[PDB]
């Protein structure tokens, strides 16, 4: 229902 | 990663898995066995029963994200992941990152005296009685029990938490069959790894089908019941991720 955190962890450098 | 994976590469692929759990257990096994002494007094359980919902909450919401990031860690690092469409990393954490933090408290729990390791030292169920969800923390040190009967070594724990996350039955999947190729090896990986050590006998006792989402399903449900009765608690202090996650 929300994963802008998720998506933005997951792309994290 | 590979349809036909050789022997070589399923060998490979017990390494990488065994390695990327390494790099993200969070716990160090040894501190957390040489500390099972370490017992939460009297007054400590006390002070903790007397602590309010809300603070409860909040603390356990805050020491479970961070459990989970180490998870969300272990799926980066984890052989064939990162390949994966956007769309099935997310439904795979969505659903798995819990499961994991479920089956990796195993380690950080003492059968001999029913007691989990949280905030410093040993303590039991009872501890966490302000949450008001009693039967879901009993529930969660059964499933630890349970598990804690299979002794599991760390390349076990490696291995099996890899098929929690890398489960191709999750629903809303969008690469199905990619998700089945990595699952498969994965097995192969945990398989050739059990047939070595002779620990094959294990595969009959590891949690019953749908047990791992029953907890998850009951903590959502529990949060969904706290939320409604302290809605500004977590607004104003739980974890995003935690949210986004559960909520
Ligand atoms: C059983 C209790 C209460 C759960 C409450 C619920 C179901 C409503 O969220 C939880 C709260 C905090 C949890 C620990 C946080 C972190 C770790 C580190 C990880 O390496 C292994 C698991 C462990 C020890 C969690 C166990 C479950 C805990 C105590």
Redesign the interface.
Same mark, same amino acid.
């Given at each position: 229902?929300? $994963?802008?955190?998720? $998506?933005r962890?997951?792309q994290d450098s | 990663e590979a349809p036909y994976a050789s022997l070589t590469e399923i060998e490979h692929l017990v390494q990488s898995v065994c390695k990327s759990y390494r790099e993200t257990c969070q716990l160090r096994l040894e501190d957390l066995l040489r500390q099972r002494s370490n017992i939460f007094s009297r007054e400590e359980v006390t002070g903790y029963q007397r602590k309010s919902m809300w603070e409860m909450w909040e603390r356990c919401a805050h020491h479970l994200t961070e459990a989970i /990031?180490y998870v969300?860690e272990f799926a980066?690092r984890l052989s064939g992941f990162?390949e994966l469409c /956007?769309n099935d /990393?997310?439904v795979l =954490?969505?659903a798995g990152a819990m499961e994991v933090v479920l089956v990796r408290m195993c380690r950080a729990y003492n059968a001999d005296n029913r007691t989990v390791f949280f905030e410093g030292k040993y303590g039991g169920m009872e501890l966490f009685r302000a949450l008001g969800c009693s039967e879901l923390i009993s529930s969660i040190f059964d499933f630890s029990h349970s598990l804690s009967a299979l002794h599991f070594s760390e390349d076990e724990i490696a291995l099996y938490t890899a098929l929690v996350l890398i489960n191709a039955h999750r629903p809303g999947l969008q690469e199905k069959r990619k998700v089945e190729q990595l699952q498969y090896n994965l097995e192969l990986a945990f398989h050739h790894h059990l047939c070595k050590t002779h620990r094959q006998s294990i595969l009959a006792k590891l949690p019953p089908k749908g047990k791992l989402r029953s907890l998850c399903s009951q903590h959502v449900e529990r949060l969904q019941i706290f939320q409604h009765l302290h809605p500004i608690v977590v607004q104003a202090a739980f974890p995003? =991720?935690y949210?986004?996650?559960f909520?």
């Open positions: 229902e929300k $994963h802008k955190i998720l $998506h962890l997951l | /990031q969300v980066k990162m /956007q /990393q997310i =954490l969505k995003p =991720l949210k986004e996650l909520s």
